[PDB]
Amino acid sequence: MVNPTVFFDIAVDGEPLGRVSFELFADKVPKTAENFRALSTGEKGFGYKGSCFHRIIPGFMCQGGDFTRHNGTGGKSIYGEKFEDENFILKHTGPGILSMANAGPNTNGSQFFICTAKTEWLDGKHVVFGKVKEGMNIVEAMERFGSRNGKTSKKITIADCGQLE
């Protein structure tokens, strides 16, 4: 079939900003893509809606997906607490790359990051599974609320999220 597309509706201190949409690479990382897809729809009873981008470093990346500790230490996959690195077929080529955050080999949960630069040192250690399709202007707006140490000057939230036709 066709690779799924997922959207995030982003808010800044509760104020609507815009929509970021993502192509998920189910054709190359079906397991990893399915996790992010189901967390986006909330169809297992948990996921990304209402959570925040807790760490944003301009010229590097926007990190989110921690809906259990809201700070980078939590989250869980649709398969259990953690799942294996599925493969490293896809590389971190530039801005818009969507990739899994982790704390060691085989520790993927729900946390993910959106690259805003090429981050080749992450290749072969973070599983890349998607890419921003629309709203890279919105990801760039988000990023302006980050800082050098990653603390956001405003609260950046996924006000709504879902799967698109």
Among 3, 60, 70, 163, the one annotated catalytic: 60
Q: Annotate 28-64 with DSSP letters as a single string.
A: T-HHHHHHHHHHHHTTTS-SSTT-B--EEETTTEEEE
Q: Annotate the chain with DSSP letters as a single string.
A: -PPPEEEEEEEETTEEEEEEEEEE-TTT-HHHHHHHHHHHHTTTS-SSTT-B--EEETTTEEEE--TTTSSSS---BBTBS-B------S---STTEEEE--SSTT-B-S-EEEESS--GGGTTTS-EEEEEEE-HHHHHHHHTT--TTS--SS-EEEEEEEEE-
- Residue 152 has phi, psi (to 5 degrees) of -95, 140
**Catalytic annotation present for 113:** yes
Selected binder of ligand WM1 within 102, 134, 150, 159 (CB under 6 A): 102
- Write out the binding residues for ligand WM1, residues 36-95 only, by CB under 6 A: 61, 63, 72-73, 75
**Catalytic annotation present for 92:** no
**Catalytic annotation present for 90:** no
Residue number with CB closer to ligand WM1 (73 or 137): 73
CB of 1 to ligand WM1, least distance (A): 27
- Closest residue to ligand WM1: CB criterion: 109
CB of 45 to ligand WM1, least distance (A): 18
Stretch that binds ligand WM1, among 5-13, 28-36, 42-50, 99-107 (CB under 6 A): 99-107
- By CB under 6 A, tell whether 105 contacts ligand WM1: no
- By CB under 6 A, tell whether 32 contacts ligand WM1: no
**Catalytic annotation present for 122:** yes
Judged by the rule CB under 6 A, the positions of this chain that interact with ligand WM1 are: 61, 63, 72-73, 75, 101-103, 109, 111, 113, 120-122
Positions annotated as catalytic residues are: 55, 60, 63, 102, 113, 122, 126
